[PDB]
A = this chain, B = another copy of it.
Amino acid sequence: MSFRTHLESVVNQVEGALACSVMGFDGISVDTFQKDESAELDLNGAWVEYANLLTQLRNAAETLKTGTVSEVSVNSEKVLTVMRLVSPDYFLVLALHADGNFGKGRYVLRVTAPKVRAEL
């Protein structure tokens, strides 16, 4: 709950951002901020693919617990993701539409991750 201001900041800064969330390695979502605004595209196709990535996101996210791995992406045709470690139990995930700014997404999540880590 202390996180949501940071999750909202990520979505606000990244063109095409669907959602920014904290997720547990136990597969239980902790907090989210979702794109509320009328997008310049129809995002329902993206929401379908994002739902269909959730199992695989948490599987790939496990690699973040290794010292060397700092960032993981699991991407579909319509949806890109960026994930970073926030604690031994939690990771941060940004989902954006494939036509969004993936470079800005990676940069903004790198800047925001320490702020989320500080709220634990």
Contact = CB atoms under 8 A, between A and B. Distances in A.
B63 A56 contact: yes
A78 to B, nearest CB: 9
Contact of A74 (B55, B72, B102, B106): B72
A71 B75 CA distance: 5
A8 interface: no
- Of A52, A62, A69, most buried by chain B (CB within 10 Å of CB) is A69
Given A60-B63, A63-B59, A76 B72 contact: no
A75 B72 contact: yes
24 contacts: A49-B68, A52-B66, A52-B67, A53-B68, A53-B69, A55-B66, A56-B63, A56-B69, A59-B60, A59-B62, A59-B63, A60-B63, A69-B75, A69-B76, A70-B75, A70-B76, A70-B77, A71-B75, A72-B73, A72-B74, A73-B73, A73-B75, A102-B103, A102-B106
